[PDB]
Amino acid sequence: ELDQLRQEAEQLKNQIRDARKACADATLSQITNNIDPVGRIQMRTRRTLRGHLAKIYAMHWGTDSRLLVSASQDGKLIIWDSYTTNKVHAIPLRSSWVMTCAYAPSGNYVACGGLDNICSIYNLKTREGNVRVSRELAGHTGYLSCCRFLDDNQIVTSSGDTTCALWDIETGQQTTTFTGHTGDVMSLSLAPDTRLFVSGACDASAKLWDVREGMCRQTFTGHESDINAICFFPNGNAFATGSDDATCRLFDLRADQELMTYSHDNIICGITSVSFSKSGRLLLAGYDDFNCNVWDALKADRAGVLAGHDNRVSCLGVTDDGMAVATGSWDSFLKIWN
Amino acid sequence: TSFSILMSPFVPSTIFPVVKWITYVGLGISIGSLILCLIIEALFWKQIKKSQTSHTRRICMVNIALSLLIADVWFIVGATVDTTVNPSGVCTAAVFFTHFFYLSLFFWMLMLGILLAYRIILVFHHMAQHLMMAVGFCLGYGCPLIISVITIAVTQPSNTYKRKDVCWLNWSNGSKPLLAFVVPALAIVAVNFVVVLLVLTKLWRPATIIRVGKSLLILTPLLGLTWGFGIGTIVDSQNLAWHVIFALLNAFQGFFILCFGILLDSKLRQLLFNKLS
Amino acid sequence: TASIAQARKLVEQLKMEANIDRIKVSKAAADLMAYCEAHAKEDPLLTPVPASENPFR
Amino acid sequence: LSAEDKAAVERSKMIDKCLSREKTYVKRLVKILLLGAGESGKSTFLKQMRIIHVNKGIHEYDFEIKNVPFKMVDVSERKRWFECFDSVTSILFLVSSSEFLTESLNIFETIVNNRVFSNVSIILFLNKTDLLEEKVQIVSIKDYFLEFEGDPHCLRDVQKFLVECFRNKRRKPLYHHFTTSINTENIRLVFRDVKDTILHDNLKQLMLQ
Amino acid sequence: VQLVESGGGLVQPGGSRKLSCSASGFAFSSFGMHWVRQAPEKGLEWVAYISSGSGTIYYADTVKGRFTISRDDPKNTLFLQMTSLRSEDTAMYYCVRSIYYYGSSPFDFWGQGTTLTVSADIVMTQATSSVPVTPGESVSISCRSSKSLLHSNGNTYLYWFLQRPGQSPQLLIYRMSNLASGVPDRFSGSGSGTAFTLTISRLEAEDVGVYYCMQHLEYPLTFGAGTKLEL
């Protein structure tokens, strides 16, 4: 019976491959052979947010486009004022081996998590005036790669146990568990409508999950190694991934297939982070060659280079007004570009 | 004008016609090598900042180069200016400046030696970067200022900080301000010597000869072990050939610093050759 | 036994994913450029703004 | 400034102070992974050091050997996340010499050749050597197929083969030891290896090697 | 949160006194602290400010140097040391909590304070000392300033507080627009440089009392006479 089911699975995979080959009427590059390139976009360091004592592993902007939570391996989680380079908060973490952070859309909460398999949610606005741990969320068998808030009482985690989780923060229990990955999940991004999300997971496969229903809505393939970064175009109907195979790729959910590959023959190091510009015209990608590049998303050419980091760029993020972009690298420095 | 006049109270008149020219050629090469070294350090400063220990070492390097440039220029100045026409102004400002900046050189070399000893012996000890900066700049420039100012305050009103012929500093059966340079400098050299041996103590534990020799010849110019030949030029007048050794190994000290403490580092060589192409 | 159940889950998931609606790449390209052209002036990194308005200049 | 910025600025400065006050401590802290390929040996060895000291996910253990802060981390596939440990001073690799070791050798080879671990030294503890001595003395199958040193030896030729096998998958130094059944001393023998490691790092940083 | 102030009482002409505040239920070391006075039948007035980290200290120019401020963070106890107390110092003093970071809510908590009896700067006019109102009807209150408070950073630094009869003031409006926590959403207000009207839609009971308006644009902080909504 196992052989019969394996044959059925192979037939279904062949059907999916044929279906995705059908809709590929023309490559995305061909429809873009008439768009004005954006040229060389030279962004300078308006602010250098220094203070982290070790490698910065994650970063997140506020919805006010001014506050910024950065998170480093020394066990600290610092909230900066991007405009004035002011440290608003310094939250000491209980586990230093932490590899993600998030900033609540309402601004009342931040999130973090890592090798302790716990997603810690911190309350920023308390009467007592200190940032205390609102909740430790437990249940993941592996390490935690990324966490994002849908709202103040629902969070989403991805973990290196082939599993994502939607948590009700008040109760503390997994409201939904998303399974289906084979390898360790590395990055997830939430749609603007906060009803869907996407996940990359070390098996060169990405998955679009429905938060409410809980089932794997769609899958995508094409990469060659670990998928280390993922994000949505700023409308929730496209998403770009970066991998250790030194190749960024732009996928679309409705087309359900690969659309572009951002790569260069001189790019041999992997991709640690990706984030889109507000209009979607710029995809800023962080790399392990110490640099961060800026691709004209619609033309797959390199619009710019955000050089300035002496170690590997681990995180980057474009604000909600698109004003700046922040890059954090393993040099313990965070930098605001505009 | 001999270089040995820094250490030696006397210079033999027979070898003087060669010693003075050794000093001129060496000082030209030394000032040029120091200018080139500081240009390289400034241009490549942002490309070498890798670790705190290497940061302190490069600070000590830059300060040593600066001190030797200033003091070498001042020594040539004091050599080219007559004493009879200018009893004051130049040739007394030159004397204090050259003394101060040679003490700056020797105390920055002492700081490099102390850094080596601190990073080899007290392996599990760390201390604030700015506080290391404070100690290094307070000893490397505070102590030379203190020593030279005390010497001038205890000598000049009695007119002894001057020399008779060449504008450097005196020691003649009376006031002995020369021992405000020979005594500290050589003392520092002694300390540096111990440090060098300790490093060999760590490099002979296990291409051993090649590595040991490379370390010894990259540390001798930067720790100023060659200045130890000054001992001879005070111990005896000439004997075999001490002044020639002093000039040939110490006047070119800037050249050796450029060649070994700058041009023998692999990373600096790679960056400089890539830029020059 | 357990492998049979895992294979059943895999087959059901593949069947569920196969039947989803699909559109051509041309529509995806059109919508991406539509969003990019619709919001070009509000993308300050793409189109730099005067320093008198820029919160970082 | 509107003075509500000024106070704001002041707040930031205070935070900076705290972070600076920790930088010096972070440098003073020495990190050692514990990779042992098993569960019983690691438990026994950590138990011995915990007896010496007293007198979840990652299990960080904090101790002091000679007034030096020490953190032993003690965390299928281990590729991307297993890169945050490039900041550690050492990797204490505990394997038993009385149970054969192709898997231990292969894991060692994967560990040592990783660019993550280039600036990280490795301390190869070969424990349960009493068990190895007994296994050799009492008639038991001895290591073969390359062991050109004589199987029925007392204690030495088998040990030399084991180590010369362990030092061969290297394309920072690789220390090694033959601690006894549990042990009598273990902290002062890892302290030496970490001190030599940091001394060589310091010598390299001073372009003095 | 709880700020309990102690030390008040009656003093002879001259003399001295040491008022203190015990802070319980919050991170007192992270909070800047203020001393704010109020004459027995008059408006509020600012006294002093100590900052987080015991650094910045500002004084009221009226009695500056005659008193000092201090804090003891481990004990969470604030101090004001008054010296040479004349009759003009007869007021009820209140210890106020204010934290300054982006988006903070300065002056968010006030103690009950203690009485203390004895036997250029920006000016605000509280245009009215009383406004007769009927409960259930909307009310609006006027303060006029003698300088623009819209600083170049985009803020505006005028504050509205409410003293209900027999109570200590509670922050209604911080920074000329915003609403504090624990106050109903029916309170609001708007203005421009040198003019503001506070708005209370659906005036309920317990809203009777005096409304005060303050400038934290620079020092000193100046208070108005406060409008007394009556019912």
Side-chain angles (χ1 to χ4, degrees):
Chain A
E1 187 176 358
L2 181 57
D3 301 287
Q4 291 94 323
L5 291 163
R6 284 169 174 165
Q7 291 168 348
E8 288 178 352
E10 293 298 318
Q11 289 170 346
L12 287 166
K13 284 189 286 184
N14 289 335
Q15 171 190 346
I16 284 168
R17 185 180 65 252
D18 291 346
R20 292 171 181 170
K21 284 183 176 182
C23 297
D25 58 346
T27 74
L28 174 47
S29 66
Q30 288 177 308
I31 297 89
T32 62
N33 58 358
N34 67 330
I35 289 311
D36 291 331
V38 311
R40 174 184 169 88
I41 308 169
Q42 186 168 328
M43 278 153 273
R44 330 194 183 282
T45 305
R46 298 321 216 270
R47 311 288 191 299
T48 306
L49 315 173
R50 43 187 75 250
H52 268 308
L53 295 174
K55 300 181 164 188
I56 283 169
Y57 58 78
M59 183 278 288
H60 197 283
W61 278 104
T63 61
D64 53 0
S65 305
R66 179 171 175 171
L67 284 179
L68 188 152
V69 62
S70 66
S72 81
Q73 289 282 117
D74 78 327
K76 299 294 187 291
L77 185 65
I78 289 173
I79 301 174
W80 319 81
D81 188 348
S82 57
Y83 287 14
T84 69
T85 66
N86 281 147
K87 294 179 179 70
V88 178
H89 289 110
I91 314 161
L93 302 175
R94 185 178 296 113
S95 66
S96 71
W97 316 104
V98 60
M99 338 178 291
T100 188
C101 69
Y103 191 77
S106 70
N108 305 325
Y109 293 103
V110 294
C112 75
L115 268 298
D116 63 358
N117 310 330
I118 301 299
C119 187
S120 302
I121 293 164
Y122 293 84
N123 194 339
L124 299 187
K125 300 180 188 183
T126 61
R127 298 294 296 163
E128 308 59 33
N130 50 32
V131 176
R132 65 179 177 88
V133 160
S134 179
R135 187 149 329 260
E136 311 179 353
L137 295 174
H140 278 297
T141 317
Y143 63 91
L144 215 69
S145 298
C146 181
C147 56
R148 295 291 185 269
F149 278 88
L150 294 166
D151 63 358
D152 292 346
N153 190 359
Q154 292 176 104
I155 209 160
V156 187
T157 57
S158 68
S159 195
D161 62 356
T162 79
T163 293
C164 310
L166 170 81
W167 318 71
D168 185 296
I169 304 167
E170 175 209 71
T171 60
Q173 297 320 344
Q174 287 189 338
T175 307
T176 309
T177 287
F178 314 93
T179 58
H181 283 300
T182 284
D184 282 349
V185 187
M186 293 270 99
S187 179
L188 74 164
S189 181
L190 299 175
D193 63 358
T194 55
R195 293 170 162 122
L196 278 289
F197 73 103
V198 298
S199 175
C202 287
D203 62 358
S205 85
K207 282 179 178 281
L208 161 74
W209 310 91
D210 189 358
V211 184
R212 296 173 180 174
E213 294 295 314
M215 65 179 288
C216 173
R217 182 65 60 84
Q218 307 204 0
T219 198
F220 312 95
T221 58
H223 270 248
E224 280 171 15
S225 178
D226 295 332
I227 295 174
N228 317 124
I230 198 163
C231 66
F232 291 104
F233 201 86
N235 46 359
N237 70 11
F239 75 98
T241 57
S243 285
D244 279 326
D245 69 3
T247 300
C248 263
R249 291 180 178 90
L250 184 77
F251 292 110
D252 192 352
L253 312 178
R254 299 179 304 169
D256 202 37
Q257 63 172 256
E258 174 181 19
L259 269 67
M260 276 180 183
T261 68
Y262 316 105
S263 72
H264 200 272
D265 288 346
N266 290 112
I267 294 182
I268 59 170
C269 65
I271 298 169
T272 57
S273 296
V274 296
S275 183
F276 272 105
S277 69
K278 176 174 177 63
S279 62
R281 192 60 199 256
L282 293 188
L283 178 73
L284 298 98
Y287 292 81
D288 288 325
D289 68 298
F290 293 168
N291 281 330
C292 165
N293 291 317
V294 176
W295 277 268
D296 210 26
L298 305 184
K299 281 187 72 67
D301 207 334
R302 201 194 309 209
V305 177
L306 293 174
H309 279 297
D310 310 343
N311 210 315
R312 293 166 35 182
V313 162
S314 62
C315 56
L316 66 91
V318 176
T319 68
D320 288 331
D321 53 2
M323 185 64 72
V325 55
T327 53
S329 162
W330 281 0
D331 54 3
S332 73
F333 288 170
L334 195 67
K335 294 201 174 189
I336 290 168
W337 311 83
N338 202 16
Chain B
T1 62
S2 298
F3 203 110
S4 73
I5 209 165
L6 302 199
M7 295 296 172
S8 70
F10 177 75
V11 174
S13 66
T14 59
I15 204 71
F16 173 80
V18 184
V19 179
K20 65 185 190 183
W21 290 118
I22 298 162
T23 297
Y24 291 166
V25 176
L27 266 286
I29 301 296
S30 171
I31 293 171
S33 296
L34 285 171
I35 288 167
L36 193 53
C37 166
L38 273 168
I39 288 168
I40 290 170
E41 279 279 354
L43 285 173
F44 293 64
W45 191 250
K46 66 185 179 182
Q47 299 182 343
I48 61 171
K49 189 176 180 181
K50 306 304 179 184
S51 71
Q52 283 77 16
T53 299
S54 46
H55 179 62
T56 311
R57 178 192 190 278
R58 285 299 182 181
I59 289 153
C60 294
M61 292 299 291
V62 166
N63 287 271
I64 294 169
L66 183 65
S67 296
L68 195 79
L69 188 153
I70 298 162
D72 285 346
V73 169
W74 266 127
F75 173 85
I76 282 182
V77 168
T80 58
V81 176
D82 204 330
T83 56
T84 64
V85 186
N86 306 283
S88 190
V90 294
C91 275
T92 310
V95 160
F96 169 86
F97 272 117
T98 185
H99 181 206
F100 160 88
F101 284 101
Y102 279 152
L103 267 294
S104 164
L105 171 78
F106 279 97
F107 263 82
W108 273 120
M109 299 187 286
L110 177 63
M111 272 292 318
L112 189 57
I114 281 169
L115 176 76
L116 295 181
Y118 165 64
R119 288 306 185 194
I120 280 167
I121 297 169
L122 302 183
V123 175
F124 305 106
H125 188 293
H126 286 263
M127 64 180 288
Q129 175 66 232
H130 68 273
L131 191 153
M132 293 177 71
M133 295 299 291
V135 181
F137 271 105
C138 280
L139 277 296
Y141 278 127
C143 275
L145 192 61
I146 277 167
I147 294 164
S148 51
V149 174
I150 297 299
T151 308
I152 201 164
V154 189
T155 57
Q156 180 52 51
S158 301
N159 190 32
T160 56
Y161 210 63
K162 189 71 71 174
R163 270 193 83 104
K164 290 187 178 180
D165 45 1
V166 178
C167 295
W168 156 247
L169 190 62
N170 275 326
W171 171 46
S172 187
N173 286 295
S175 308
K176 321 172 281 288
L178 189 57
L179 273 71
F181 175 73
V182 176
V183 160
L186 289 167
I188 282 166
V189 167
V191 165
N192 269 342
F193 189 73
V194 171
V195 173
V196 164
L197 282 184
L198 182 57
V199 169
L200 301 178
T201 300
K202 308 302 188 192
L203 295 180
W204 275 115
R205 170 67 182 84
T208 304
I209 291 167
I210 295 166
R211 291 193 300 273
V212 159
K214 176 183 176 183
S215 293
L216 185 66
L217 277 296
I218 194 167
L219 275 193
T220 299
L222 285 173
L223 293 188
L225 267 65
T226 62
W227 285 85
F229 293 100
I231 292 294
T233 64
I234 289 90
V235 161
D236 213 324
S237 79
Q238 168 52 279
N239 202 313
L240 294 167
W242 291 136
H243 295 305
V244 191
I245 300 172
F246 192 102
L248 277 172
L249 294 178
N250 301 292
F252 311 90
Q253 188 180 8
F255 162 69
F256 285 150
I257 278 175
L258 180 142
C259 188
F260 303 175
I262 300 297
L263 259 61
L264 205 60
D265 191 5
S266 309
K267 179 66 173 176
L268 193 150
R269 279 207 309 269
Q270 288 171 358
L271 290 174
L272 182 61
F273 275 105
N274 285 340
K275 182 176 175 65
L276 288 170
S277 177
Chain C
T1 60
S3 294
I4 293 169
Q6 292 167 348
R8 285 176 182 173
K9 286 181 181 179
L10 175 62
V11 165
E12 183 69 23
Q13 191 62 40
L14 280 173
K15 183 178 177 181
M16 288 296 108
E17 291 174 18
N19 290 326
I20 205 157
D21 293 349
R22 294 178 172 86
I23 72 169
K24 290 180 179 177
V25 183
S26 64
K27 192 62 164 62
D31 288 346
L32 285 163
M33 318 171 167
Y35 190 97
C36 288
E37 291 179 341
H39 294 88
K41 65 186 179 182
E42 297 173 350
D43 192 343
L45 284 187
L46 170 65
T47 304
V49 302
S52 66
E53 296 176 6
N54 198 300
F56 291 102
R57 304 184 194 210
Chain D
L1 303 177
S2 48
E4 293 193 358
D5 288 328
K6 293 168 134 297
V9 168
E10 153 165 9
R11 183 174 176 86
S12 179
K13 285 202 196 209
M14 293 177 70
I15 294 169
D16 265 326
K17 290 182 181 180
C18 291
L19 295 163
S20 67
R21 284 171 66 191
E22 293 180 354
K23 213 172 169 179
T24 62
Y25 175 79
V26 168
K27 294 181 176 67
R28 287 186 183 98
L29 177 72
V30 170
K31 284 182 177 68
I32 299 169
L33 289 173
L34 182 66
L35 304 179
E39 294 182 357
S40 67
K42 291 166 74 175
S43 179
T44 300
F45 196 70
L46 288 172
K47 176 182 177 180
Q48 181 178 2
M49 290 180 183
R50 282 192 294 269
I51 290 166
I52 295 166
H53 186 75
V54 174
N55 277 327
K56 299 298 293 295
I58 296 170
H59 289 254
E60 293 179 353
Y61 300 90
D62 299 346
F63 63 93
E64 308 211 326
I65 303 185
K66 292 293 183 182
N67 306 314
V68 172
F70 269 92
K71 186 180 289 293
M72 185 179 288
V73 155
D74 177 350
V75 65
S76 66
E77 62 274 13
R78 297 175 289 117
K79 45 183 175 289
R80 178 66 178 173
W81 70 269
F82 199 76
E83 187 171 351
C84 57
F85 306 114
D86 47 352
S87 80
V88 311
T89 310
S90 295
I91 292 170
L92 183 56
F93 182 76
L94 286 160
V95 296
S96 295
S97 306
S98 69
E99 183 178 2
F100 55 86
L101 293 163
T102 301
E103 298 167 352
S104 291
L105 287 161
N106 286 339
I107 295 167
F108 198 85
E109 190 177 5
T110 304
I111 284 158
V112 302
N113 299 329
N114 205 324
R115 296 184 296 275
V116 180
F117 282 170
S118 68
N119 286 352
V120 176
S121 69
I122 301 135
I123 307 170
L124 179 90
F125 283 186
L126 301 174
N127 50 353
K128 307 295 185 178
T129 61
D130 298 357
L131 288 175
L132 170 60
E133 188 174 1
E134 293 177 350
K135 185 176 177 177
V136 177
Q137 197 274 332
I138 297 89
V139 176
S140 296
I141 52 170
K142 295 289 94 176
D143 201 354
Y144 48 86
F145 167 70
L146 281 74
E147 196 259 333
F148 293 100
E149 292 292 327
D151 304 279
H153 196 254
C154 52
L155 196 55
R156 283 194 289 271
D157 278 342
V158 298
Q159 280 188 0
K160 166 181 183 184
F161 178 54
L162 288 174
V163 178
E164 70 185 342
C165 194
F166 267 127
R167 293 176 162 271
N168 265 338
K169 270 76 65 174
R170 293 204 69 175
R171 68 184 185 272
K172 300 298 292 295
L174 202 148
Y175 306 87
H176 88 269
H177 310 268
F178 286 132
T179 175
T180 187
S181 170
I182 313 98
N183 197 347
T184 298
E185 182 65 26
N186 266 322
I187 60 168
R188 187 200 54 79
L189 173 134
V190 188
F191 180 69
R192 302 219 310 268
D193 292 347
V194 300
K195 184 178 184 293
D196 284 346
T197 306
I198 306 176
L199 165 62
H200 286 183
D201 279 340
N202 284 346
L203 280 173
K204 270 170 103 173
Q205 282 179 353
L206 295 153
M207 283 73 74
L208 177 62
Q209 183 75 52
Chain E
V1 183
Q2 189 174 25
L3 279 307
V4 181
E5 293 85 6
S6 67
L10 168 65
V11 298
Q12 63 260 32
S16 66
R17 182 65 60 84
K18 180 169 77 178
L19 314 181
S20 69
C21 191
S22 87
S24 53
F26 64 103
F28 177 79
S29 293
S30 292
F31 280 90
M33 300 295 285
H34 304 260
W35 276 95
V36 174
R37 59 157 72 195
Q38 170 174 36
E41 296 183 356
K42 300 294 187 291
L44 310 149
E45 217 174 2
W46 169 75
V47 171
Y49 166 65
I50 188 168
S51 178
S52 168
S54 287
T56 296
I57 287 173
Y58 299 130
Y59 282 89
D61 286 344
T62 302
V63 192
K64 179 169 188 182
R66 294 174 178 83
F67 61 86
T68 174
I69 198 169
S70 78
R71 80 198 290 166
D72 200 330
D73 288 341
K75 300 181 183 176
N76 283 336
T77 301
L78 212 82
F79 301 94
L80 183 90
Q81 188 76 66
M82 295 299 291
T83 69
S84 298
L85 283 161
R86 282 172 55 93
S87 66
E88 293 90 8
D89 290 308
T90 294
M92 185 180 288
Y93 292 87
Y94 303 77
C95 171
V96 200
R97 162 186 84 161
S98 81
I99 211 155
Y100 307 99
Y101 46 89
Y102 180 66
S104 70
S105 172
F107 283 71
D108 56 338
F109 209 89
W110 297 64
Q112 77 267 33
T114 61
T115 70
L116 186 58
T117 308
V118 181
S119 173
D121 301 359
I122 312 173
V123 160
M124 281 183 284
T125 297
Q126 202 100 45
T128 176
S129 68
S130 173
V131 171
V133 297
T134 301
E137 303 289 337
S138 296
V139 58
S140 267
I141 279 166
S142 54
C143 288
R144 296 309 311 266
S145 164
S146 69
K147 186 176 176 178
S148 172
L149 303 171
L150 195 150
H151 188 279
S152 65
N153 56 6
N155 289 145
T156 322
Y157 298 98
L158 210 158
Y159 290 72
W160 280 261
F161 304 87
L162 163 62
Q163 271 184 268
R164 301 172 167 98
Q167 287 194 358
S168 179
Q170 172 193 25
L171 184 72
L172 319 162
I173 292 174
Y174 67 89
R175 298 203 205 99
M176 294 300 293
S177 172
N178 293 110
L179 193 73
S181 296
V183 298
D185 62 357
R186 60 171 185 263
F187 291 76
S188 190
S190 68
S192 63
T194 70
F196 186 110
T197 302
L198 183 153
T199 59
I200 316 174
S201 299
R202 311 310 316 158
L203 184 85
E204 293 179 353
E206 304 294 331
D207 275 335
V208 188
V210 298
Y211 290 58
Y212 279 109
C213 64
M214 182 180 72
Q215 278 171 142
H216 208 145
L217 165 81
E218 64 186 66
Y219 293 79
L221 329 175
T222 316
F223 274 107
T227 61
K228 187 178 178 181
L229 295 203
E230 303 178 358
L231 177 63

